[PDB]
Design a protein around this motif. Structure first.
Motif, mmCIF file in Angstrom:
data_model
loop_
_atom_site.group_PDB
_atom_site.id
_atom_site.type_symbol
_atom_site.label_atom_id
_atom_site.label_comp_id
_atom_site.label_asym_id
_atom_site.label_seq_id
_atom_site.Cartn_x
_atom_site.Cartn_y
_atom_site.Cartn_z
ATOM 1 N N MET A 50 0.852 -1.184 0.000
ATOM 2 C CA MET A 50 0.000 0.000 0.000
ATOM 3 C C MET A 50 0.893 1.240 0.000
ATOM 4 O O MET A 50 1.909 1.282 0.739
ATOM 5 N N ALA A 51 0.592 2.210 -0.897
ATOM 6 C CA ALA A 51 1.404 3.440 -0.957
ATOM 7 C C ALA A 51 1.065 4.325 0.208
ATOM 8 O O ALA A 51 -0.074 4.344 0.673
ATOM 9 N N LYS A 52 2.050 5.104 0.668
ATOM 10 C CA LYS A 52 1.782 6.086 1.707
ATOM 11 C C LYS A 52 1.597 7.428 1.015
ATOM 12 O O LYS A 52 2.426 7.807 0.132
ATOM 13 N N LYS A 53 0.579 8.192 1.434
ATOM 14 C CA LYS A 53 0.338 9.519 0.859
ATOM 15 C C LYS A 53 1.029 10.492 1.774
ATOM 16 O O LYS A 53 0.642 10.622 2.966
ATOM 17 N N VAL A 54 1.993 11.235 1.215
ATOM 18 C CA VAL A 54 2.780 12.180 1.991
ATOM 19 C C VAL A 54 2.828 13.500 1.226
ATOM 20 O O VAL A 54 2.580 13.557 0.019
ATOM 21 N N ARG A 55 3.268 14.557 1.892
ATOM 22 C CA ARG A 55 3.335 15.890 1.275
ATOM 23 C C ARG A 55 4.808 16.349 1.342
ATOM 24 O O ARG A 55 5.366 16.447 2.423
ATOM 25 N N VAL A 68 3.711 7.115 -2.290
ATOM 26 C CA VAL A 68 5.021 6.430 -2.288
ATOM 27 C C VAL A 68 4.929 4.967 -1.900
ATOM 28 O O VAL A 68 4.419 4.667 -0.855
ATOM 29 N N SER A 69 5.481 4.078 -2.730
ATOM 30 C CA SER A 69 5.551 2.631 -2.421
ATOM 31 C C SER A 69 6.732 2.063 -3.200
ATOM 32 O O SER A 69 7.073 2.620 -4.240
ATOM 33 N N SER A 70 7.258 0.905 -2.772
ATOM 34 C CA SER A 70 8.385 0.279 -3.472
ATOM 35 C C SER A 70 7.981 -0.301 -4.834
ATOM 36 O O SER A 70 8.846 -0.463 -5.698
ATOM 37 N N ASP A 71 6.675 -0.540 -5.066
ATOM 38 C CA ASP A 71 6.262 -1.028 -6.393
ATOM 39 C C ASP A 71 6.267 0.037 -7.499
ATOM 40 O O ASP A 71 6.254 -0.294 -8.690
ATOM 41 N N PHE A 130 15.188 4.051 -3.247
ATOM 42 C CA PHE A 130 15.109 5.370 -2.635
ATOM 43 C C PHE A 130 15.645 6.374 -3.632
ATOM 44 O O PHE A 130 15.052 7.443 -3.810
ATOM 45 N N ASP A 131 16.705 5.982 -4.389
ATOM 46 C CA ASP A 131 17.263 6.859 -5.408
ATOM 47 C C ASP A 131 16.259 7.201 -6.475
ATOM 48 O O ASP A 131 16.270 8.321 -6.988
ATOM 49 N N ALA A 132 15.348 6.264 -6.811
ATOM 50 C CA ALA A 132 14.337 6.591 -7.830
ATOM 51 C C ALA A 132 13.339 7.642 -7.297
ATOM 52 O O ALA A 132 12.832 8.457 -8.064
ATOM 53 N N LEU A 133 13.031 7.590 -5.997
ATOM 54 C CA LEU A 133 12.121 8.577 -5.420
ATOM 55 C C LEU A 133 12.839 9.919 -5.451
ATOM 56 O O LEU A 133 12.234 10.925 -5.840
ATOM 57 N N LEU A 134 14.116 9.940 -5.056
ATOM 58 C CA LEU A 134 14.868 11.196 -5.104
ATOM 59 C C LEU A 134 14.880 11.794 -6.493
ATOM 60 O O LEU A 134 14.790 12.991 -6.690
ATOM 61 N N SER A 167 14.860 5.850 3.807
ATOM 62 C CA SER A 167 14.189 4.803 3.061
ATOM 63 C C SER A 167 12.727 5.124 3.014
ATOM 64 O O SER A 167 12.213 5.782 3.912
ATOM 65 N N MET A 168 12.035 4.584 2.025
ATOM 66 C CA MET A 168 10.591 4.800 1.880
ATOM 67 C C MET A 168 9.845 4.205 3.044
ATOM 68 O O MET A 168 8.803 4.736 3.446
ATOM 69 N N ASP A 169 10.400 3.134 3.670
ATOM 70 C CA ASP A 169 9.744 2.514 4.816
ATOM 71 C C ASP A 169 9.599 3.480 5.978
ATOM 72 O O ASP A 169 8.722 3.293 6.820
ATOM 73 N N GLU A 170 10.456 4.486 6.046
ATOM 74 C CA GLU A 170 10.432 5.455 7.136
ATOM 75 C C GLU A 170 9.400 6.541 6.926
ATOM 76 O O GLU A 170 9.114 7.280 7.839
ATOM 77 N N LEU A 171 8.826 6.661 5.694
ATOM 78 C CA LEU A 171 7.793 7.640 5.484
ATOM 79 C C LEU A 171 6.499 7.144 6.112
ATOM 80 O O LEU A 171 6.293 5.917 6.278
ATOM 81 N N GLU A 172 5.647 8.084 6.536
ATOM 82 C CA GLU A 172 4.403 7.727 7.242
ATOM 83 C C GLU A 172 3.214 8.438 6.618
ATOM 84 O O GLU A 172 3.272 9.626 6.243
ATOM 85 N N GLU A 173 2.132 7.723 6.480
ATOM 86 C CA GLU A 173 0.902 8.256 5.888
ATOM 87 C C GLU A 173 0.478 9.572 6.508
ATOM 88 O O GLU A 173 0.385 9.652 7.724
ATOM 89 N N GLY A 174 0.254 10.578 5.680
ATOM 90 C CA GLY A 174 -0.284 11.850 6.074
ATOM 91 C C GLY A 174 0.738 12.851 6.551
ATOM 92 O O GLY A 174 0.344 13.961 6.830
#
Length: 98
Positions: free
Chosen positions: A1-6, A22-25, A30-34, A65-72
């Motif tokens: 499940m993707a996390k919605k962040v701002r 944001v999700s790993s799929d 992490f470099d691709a998100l950057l 890492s994306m795992d450290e991001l949190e919804e909202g």
């Protein structure tokens, strides 16, 4: 499940934030998100070297890492190790995620 962040731009008092799912799929690393934040947040003055670091909204924590991001939650994107302490969320709806 993707996390919605701002995401906000280090040092920019006039940016209202970009909402990401944001999700790993979708981001393979992490470099691709950057890289995708460098694309969307493109600003030669506030992000002269693109998006290389992500911090929590208050600058207290560096996200590795994306795992450290949190919804909202909200985060600040920076080209370097200096977090500029400006009121990023000033006049932004605190309920932007409702």
């Amino acid at each position: 499940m993707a996390k919605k962040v701002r995401f906000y731009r280090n040092g920019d008092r006039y940016f209202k934030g970009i909402v990401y799912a944001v999700s790993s799929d979708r981001f393979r690393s992490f470099d691709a998100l950057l890289a995708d934040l460098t694309r969307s947040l493109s600003d030669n003055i506030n992000l002269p070297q693109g998006v290389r670091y992500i911090y929590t909204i208050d600058g207290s924590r560096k996200i590795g890492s994306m795992d450290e991001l949190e919804e909202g939650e909200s985060y600040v994107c920076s080209s370097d190790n200096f977090f500029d302490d400006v009121e990023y969320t000033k006049n932004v709806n605190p309920n932007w995620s409702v």
